[PDB]
Symmetry: C6
Subunit: 221 residues, 6 copies
């Protein structure tokens, strides 16, 4: 139990405020295809849903003796190790939010009549639009809105391409539990940063495979 108290101290000394969302598989699936519902309000079409968030403190690291002090985030994009205490057993797929850290992302879409009507889901917890434009130039604020993490564009932008740069909250999902037998005892987790899991809606939809942008993207895979 001397190793436990050291770990609790580490969490307290180096931990940052996070939110924890308990995950489950969303039961909206289409029995015929196995696919989530496109516009499911629980999972937004991704097939994993979450229970209400709860606060905790979590130390996040990318290097430790267990990795030979190598940076696991360099070895594998978007990987980190989290250590936390919580009243409940943390599970695979659960999601952690670091409210005070804003991360960037860029995305681009062909705006059809459906996208005008239903809006374009962004999937992230969008906090700011840092840039937005079409081929015609800057999209002014009166011509769009962000609601329920969806981009709603003015109908004049039908059949245009919209490009977007955002700030969103830093989030991770649990890929694994570590040291499951060692040791509110500490729980140690392998984390995956959200931007390495989330796939933007496709550039253009086919009624047949959807069309992705034909652009060399240097973002690490």
């Amino acid at each position: 139990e001397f190793d436990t108290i050291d770990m609790i101290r580490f969490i307290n000394d180096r931990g940052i405020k996070v939110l924890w969302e308990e995950a489950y598989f969303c039961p909206c699936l289409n029995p015929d295809t196995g696919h989530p519902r496109v516009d499911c309000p629980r999972c937004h079409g991704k097939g994993i849903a979450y229970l209400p968030p709860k606060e905790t403190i979590m130390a996040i690291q990318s290097q430790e003796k267990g990795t030979n002090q190598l940076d696991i985030g360099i070895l594998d994009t978007g990987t980190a190790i989290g250590t936390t205490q919580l009243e409940k057993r943390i599970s695979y797929r659960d999601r952690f939010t670091v409210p005070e850290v804003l991360m960037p992302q860029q995305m681009i879409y062909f705006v059809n009549k459906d996208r005008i009507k239903k809006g374009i889901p962004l999937y992230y917890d969008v906090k700011e639009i840092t840039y937005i434009a079409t081929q015609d130039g800057t999209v002014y604020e009166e011509d769009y809105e962000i609601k329920n993490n969806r981009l709603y564009l003015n109908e004049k932008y039908e059949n245009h391409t919209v490009t977007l740069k955002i700030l969103m909250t830093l989030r991770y999902v649990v890929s694994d539990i570590l040291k499951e037998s060692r040791y509110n005892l500490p729980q140690k987790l392998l984390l995956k940063r959200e931007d390495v899991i989330v796939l933007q809606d496709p550039y253009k939809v086919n009624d047949e495979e959807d069309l992705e942008i034909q652009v060399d993207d240097p973002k690490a895979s």
Copy 2:
């Protein structure tokens, strides 16, 4: 024998109470296909069966000089090293239970008439249902039961999708024997955590390949 006494001390100093189940290949196999019987009470269709459990003490580690102090659980999901003493030779496929550690899991199923009748096998040693729902909302306790590690749902949930989150006992199966010539002498084992071996019954059955959920799962493979 000085290396032996050090190892016995380690087991005693750092070992936790576990149960050991001697494994054998289940003889329920269908001679025509080589597949276990779906609802075999010995192996539950997985083709490996176990003799009655026996208690011991086992030190469990994910790092040692033999791994360069690298975390083998990070290198390979669900891998650990166990060290124990026992009157009998421990073998590949044998199963260890850590009664005092509860692990999580999530699973999802399309509930057909067969599943109502026979129940849905969960495979784990289920200790608690932390969440259960269909597309219609929460499944109340009077509408289900867990018996012999199977989910029995009320017949009104036929043709629904049920999603489930559980707590189960931590268990490992032996993938290998290590240091077989060195050294109740210590036995050293490569372990595989259960959740990395167990495959849930498929989302939906075809009368043809079964249909799995079309969901990106971040659980480490």
Copy 3:
């Protein structure tokens, strides 16, 4: 916050002057193909465009404890780690320029009537032509010009092959964000040197796959 002040000092002690360009996906894409416009002035056909540059100071390294002091540039051609402070969140795809460092490159093209008319895009920030020739010998200065980072040749060089050696500004694009939770706080970036991303226009165009030079190139891939 003691780790933060050390990092700020490192940037200040070892940082060099750089320019930062905020990147976004260029909305010139052809809705039918997903390809950028060949001669788009924003992205030059590469599908990523940039906002006006801003100055900062960035420490650039190829070795650190996080890599076991291994040279990541040897492990992976054109990879480096950058550390900088900036008022805005740096993102994937953003581009850094090191104005005071000139890098080399060589390229070769079959000069058709289109290339005479529109010029040949070089993609780099070209600062000098160190060598230029055809099969007929040296191309004298009155017979070419570099405008908007394009090679414009005199029309007599139609149906010739031109070879070119240049100096260009050293530039990187961001492939990843590192230590996203640690810590104008320092921002730590995985960088990709430009010459490992940029693809020269093809040797010869087909009206069908374009024809690349059939030459064994020792440049690291």
Copy 4:
């Protein structure tokens, strides 16, 4: 020669009693197919035969400076390093027996009329049957026997599936010679534990590919 005397001391200090069998390729091969004879008494159908055993002392390790003190048995299932002195040159394929170490194994077979008549070869040096059963339950001792390392079942078990758990002598075969120029001088060998080479006879024979059990086996490959 100072490195030699150190090595001889190591063998003497840390060596255990082993038997050595000189191996050769068995000349029972069918000229038409290149396959050994199924029931060859020399090689039992495996195509390698052995001369009479001779005693020696061999130090067996899974970690050394030559492996960076990494456990080669974890890196590669069933691998070890042996060091011994012997009057003859030890070769690839030769087999070492550690009489005082018993190892486990499990196997399963469909019992046809041939298997009743000829018995089922187990391939290992079987010392004990720890468990034996069919779908009908425990096979009592009067209903079987182990002779010449074959399982002979009572004819009533025709068309049954028999499952078996055993103890056998620990054995290795030489995969390589190491330090062939350094240095009865010490001989250093890369060893392969028997259970990682031996393939049990197939579950069921086809008159066409034989049918193996359709069971997920966690034994390391």
Copy 5:
């Protein structure tokens, strides 16, 4: 700048005399195929040509902290790290010659009428023929000559096979630039030894794929 002066001292302390040839892509390419001209005097058919050599001093290493003191030449045949000072920016594909080091090579060819007439290009900077023969025995000096790094054989050797062993100057080509931002400032280069890039002309030509010798070659690939 204290790291710079250390690097300059290393070059001076451990550097050897080398020649540097600035490389460019040869514009002899056939527009139809993308292949260099077989007997181009600039590139000899390899598609890379060089400007006149210039002398410098270069430290050459196969081990450094950046490789964990591992021998990169063992990790990857023909790889080394060069450090040098020069008035011009050294580029990918440029070639370094170490005049005072002679390296070996062996090659073999079927001598057709073309090869008698045009000679057989050897590609290396040939300094000596250490052995030369056909199936008929030793080729005496009056029956051959080396001119412009080509083997010219007496016409009596038409339809013979000639085998050749040579000494040539040690040469490298630049595969990469390292530490491009650090720091006549030092330039640090990843080098590729010539014999790992140069491909001998084929054993026999087909008018269809050319025929290479069907011989197991232990030269590292």
Copy 6:
């Protein structure tokens, strides 16, 4: 030159007597196929021939700082590092013999009328037959002979399978030159032990692919 004198001392201190054979590609090749002549006396059908042997002293190691003190022979079967001094440049494919070290090997063949007549080439420098037999038992000495490293069997063994165990001289061939610029200066070589290159003649010949023995061989590949 202080690093040179240390290396010369190492060779002298730790070197063993070896023979060196200068290698060249054998010009017996069939112009039509590119294959050596089956019974060429120079290369025995392997396509590499050797000039008369010369004595030297060579230090042979499987571990050095350049390998992180890892055993390259474990990393890659039959690999070693040799260091020697010689008046001539040692080359790829050249062969080293360690006369005072005898190595083992086993081989097996179907004896047709050709093999009786021409003998079976063993390829190694055979020093002793430790075991020889057919399906009929031991082959007595009056019924065979080893001449020019070929097995000549009495004609009564036509249409038999012969199995053979031998002792042969330890030999290596050069796969690479290391430290080509550093530094009778020392020459440092990557070596490949002969038994990892030599392929025995096939079990049985087809007039179509030859038939190899269908036996699981544990010799490291």
